[PDB]
């Protein structure tokens, strides 16, 4: 019977693919940093797939031209979000 006794909690969280917020996977620079093309020929931003996998928009766009699937799993690819 405390001052603010928990009665209800509407928790919100999202999920993504685990491993580490590391590299881009196609390329390899930090998902938050420039990519193979920018950091060399200098905006490398992020893009998501309905499969919850995230890469630099510039790296996954180039890859999709060989085949329209996700580099990590192999499901048909579909952009979920371009927003950062």
């Amino acid at each position: 019977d405390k001052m603010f006794s928990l009665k209800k909690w509407n928790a919100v969280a999202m999920w993504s693919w685990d491993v580490e917020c590391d590299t881009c996977a196609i390329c390899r620079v930090q998902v938050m940093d420039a990519c193979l093309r920018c950091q060399a020929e200098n905006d490398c931003v992020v893009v998501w797939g309905e499969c919850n996998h995230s890469f630099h928009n510039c790296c996954m766009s180039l890859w999709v031209k060989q085949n329209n699937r996700c580099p990590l799993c192999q499901q048909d690819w579909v952009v979920q979000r371009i927003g950062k």
Partner: protein, 730 residues
């Protein structure tokens, strides 16, 4: 020879010419002798015509006198007609006893008949003619004055004009060239005089009515005074003349009336005008213009003015747009008789109204309608949908459809996270509704996915509600969402939670991982909220507060009377100043409360007013207040806008759109180039506009930039002879 036969023929011929009792025997005596004349006498055919000319003339001259003598113009025509009828009758009878003549010199082409018609003209109808016409026209004028003379007098004259020129080469020569001519001379003269006399004192509508009435009367006169035997065609021109001479001339003022009637939605007056001006070759077309103008102006006036007063008032935004649509739709359906040209003028004009340009507001507004706002609370679920149903129109007209949907979806995402919809069905309706607009599946599908995701998240939630038995499972509701869509940004304002929650999360993560291998949670506490029973000296009140607020409040769970600084709370909650301040502000200054959850030393008006040294404590006098009385228990919400969409989010969405436009454009270029291996900038840009048309209007600048990119990245290349022509590469 002629001189041997004619002496027996004549007597009979005369009787034919005088319409006397030609007996059967005479019919044949003559007929037989006609043949004998033409056959026996090489000049017979001519002599017989000559003798006929003389015999005919005698009759015609008698007829002339019988008509001419009547200085009274109407008596004259009566006589004219009488003589005419006898004359015409013989014109059709005589060729019978004379078939042999007509065959040698076809009773339909009858030469004698021609001579008869010509003689009539020579003695009467091309001279007393002047009076035949003046009289007929005076009578036509009489019909127009209201002096409805026995129509037959003029009709008779017209029949004569026509029959006289019955010559198959131009059956209406005289009639048209002289009767219709004269008709118009009298028509236009009459009305060029009277049509102004009318308007001179009458209002425009009165005249218009009179005018149309006159036209109807003229159609009747056309059926009477003018010819109906055949299509005539020129008869229509005569009606056109009536219009031009009278109505088109007056049109110069009628159009001013148009504009007025449009402004007042005087559909009946304008309806008349539509019909009258449609007859006018250059009336109704200006009316199209007038309609277009008013609609656009209304947008620039009514729509824009509304938008400025609206801010968040979605109902007015929606209805104002739709009111205009419907006001003018009705106008066209009635005033402009549902005519495609006006429907088009309206369509184009309204499109401008809609684009006179911020679908992002329309999106905010649809949200207001869809969700459980104070606005939506005044509407029946059906009314909410209905307003949106009508909005379909607006969106169809909106060019930058992606804008609306971007913001709508952003709102949906939130609505589903917080479950703050007006109801469940309205959300489903909204998704289908967007389909009804004809909007891009990319957005519409994603909205649908948001709902599907909630389902999945809830399956998980339920598992927790059943398993965790930190708290009594059930009490907690955990929504684990697809970050790739739900995490609209990377904004994850981590907050340290109450023990009851911190000791739960490890289990959430544990369970989650055991069932969702390969996945990772993103504790978006920012969007999390809950209920706590607020124990006070005065009672126990549930509080509906954000997770952040729960963390703030946690600070005093075992020590309500101890003062905790802003900074200490910051630390207790591990929050940034911005969010901390907002949540604290509500706790010490939430609207509509007579009691705040937390007490504090210095007071704040707004979140920015907090200082690190600001001391907070638990409001042990806190209570739900009813009739200014302290209740022993109850419940108060202190969340409000804490979890609702800021200029920041608005801009983030704006740029997101821009980038989508860029991405889609680039992809579209690639697709186009794959389709057509080599095309001009014009072809490329055209196709890009079309492909992306249902989302937005592509700008050539953007396209250019995407082209340069694609060239640099070897997707396409410029033609060696034309930098505007591109060739697919790689």
């Amino acid at each position: 020879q002629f001189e041997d036969k004619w002496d027996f023929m004549r007597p009979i011929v005369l009787k034919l010419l005088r319409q006397e009792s030609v007996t059967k025997q005479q019919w044949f005596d003559l007929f037989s002798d006609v043949h004998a004349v033409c056959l026996w006498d090489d000049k017979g055919p001519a002599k017989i015509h000559q003798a006929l000319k003389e015999d005919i003339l005698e009759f015609i001259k008698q007829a002339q006198a019988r008509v001419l003598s009547h200085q009274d113009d109407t008596a004259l025509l009566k006589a004219y007609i009488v003589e005419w009828r006898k004359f015409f009758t013989q014109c059709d009878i005589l060729p019978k006893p004379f078939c042999q003549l007509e065959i040698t010199l076809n009773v339909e082409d009858s030469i004698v008949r021609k001579l008869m018609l010509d003689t009539w003209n020579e003695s009467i109808f091309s001279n007393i003619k002047n009076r035949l016409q003046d009289s007929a026209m005076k009578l036509v004028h009489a019909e127009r004055l209201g002096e409805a003379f026995d129509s037959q007098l003029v009709i008779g004259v017209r029949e004569s004009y026509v029959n006289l020129c019955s010559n198959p080469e131009d059956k209406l020569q005289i009639y048209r060239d002289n009767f219709e001519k004269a008709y118009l001379d009298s028509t236009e003269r009459f009305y060029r005089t009277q049509a102004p006399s009318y308007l001179q004192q009458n209002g425009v509508q009165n005249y218009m009515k009179y005018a149309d009435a006159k036209l109807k009367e003229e159609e009747k006169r056309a059926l009477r005074y003018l010819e109906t035997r055949r299509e005539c065609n020129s008869v229509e021109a005569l009606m056109e003349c009536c219009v031009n001479a009278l109505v088109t001339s007056f049109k110069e003022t009628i159009l001013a009336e148009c504009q007025g009637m449009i402004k007042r939605n005087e559909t009946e007056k304008l309806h008349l005008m539509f019909s009258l001006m449609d007859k006018v070759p250059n009336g109704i077309e200006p009316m199209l213009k007038d309609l277009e103008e008013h609609i656009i102006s209304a947008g620039l006036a009514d729509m824009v003015a509304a938008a400025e007063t609206i801010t968040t008032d979605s109902e007015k935004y929606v209805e104002q747009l739709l009111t205009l649509f419907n006001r003018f739709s009705k106008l066209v359906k009635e005033a402009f008789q549902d005519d495609p040209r006006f429907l088009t003028a309206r369509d184009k004009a309204y499109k401008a109204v809609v684009n006179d340009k911020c679908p992002e507001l329309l999106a905010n507004y649809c949200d207001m309608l869809l969700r459980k706002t104070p606005l939506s609370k005044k509407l029946t679920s059906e009314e909410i949908e209905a307003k949106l149903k009508e909005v379909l129109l607006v969106l169809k007209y909106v060019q930058n459809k992606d804008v609306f949907m971007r913001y709508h979806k952003a709102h949906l995402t939130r609505r589903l996270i917080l479950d703050i919809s007006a109801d469940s069905e309205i959300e489903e309706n909204m998704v289908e509704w967007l389909r009804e607009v004809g909007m891009p599946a990319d957005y519409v599908n994603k909205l649908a996915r948001m709902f599907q995701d909630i389902k999945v998240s809830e399956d998980l939630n339920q598992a927790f509600k059943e398993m965790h038995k930190a708290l009594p499972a059930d009490s907690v509701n955990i929504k684990i969402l697809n970050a790739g869509a739900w995490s609209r940004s990377s904004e994850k304002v981590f907050v340290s939670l109450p023990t009851e929650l911190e000791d739960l999360i490890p289990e959430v993560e544990e369970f989650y991982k055991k069932n969702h291998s390969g996945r990772k949670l993103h504790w978006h506490h920012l969007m999390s909220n809950g209920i706590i029973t607020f124990k006070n000296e005065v009672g126990q009140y549930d509080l509906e507060v954000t997770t952040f607020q729960l963390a703030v409040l946690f600070a005093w769970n075992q020590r309500p009377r101890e003062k905790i600084s802003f900074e200490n709370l910051k630390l207790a909650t591990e929050l940034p100043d911005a969010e901390l301040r907002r949540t604290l502000w509500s706790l010490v200054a939430f609207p509509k409360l007579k009691r705040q959850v937390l007490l504090y030393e210095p007071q704040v008006n707004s979140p920015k007013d907090f200082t690190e040294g600001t001391l907070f404590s638990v409001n042990q006098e806190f209570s739900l207040i009813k009739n200014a009385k302290v209740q022993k228990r109850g419940k108060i919400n202190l969340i409000g806008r804490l979890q609702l969409t800021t200029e920041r989010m608005r801009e983030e969405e704006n740029e997101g759109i821009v980038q989508l436009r860029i991405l889609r454009t680039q992809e579209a270029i690639i697709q186009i180039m794959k389709m057509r291996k080599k095309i001009s900038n014009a072809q490329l840009q055209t196709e890009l506009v079309e492909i992306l048309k249902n989302m937005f209007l592509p700008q050539k600048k953007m396209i250019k930039e995407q082209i340069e990119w694609l060239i640099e990245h070897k997707y396409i290349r410029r033609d060696e002879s034309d930098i505007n022509t591109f060739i697919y590469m790689a």
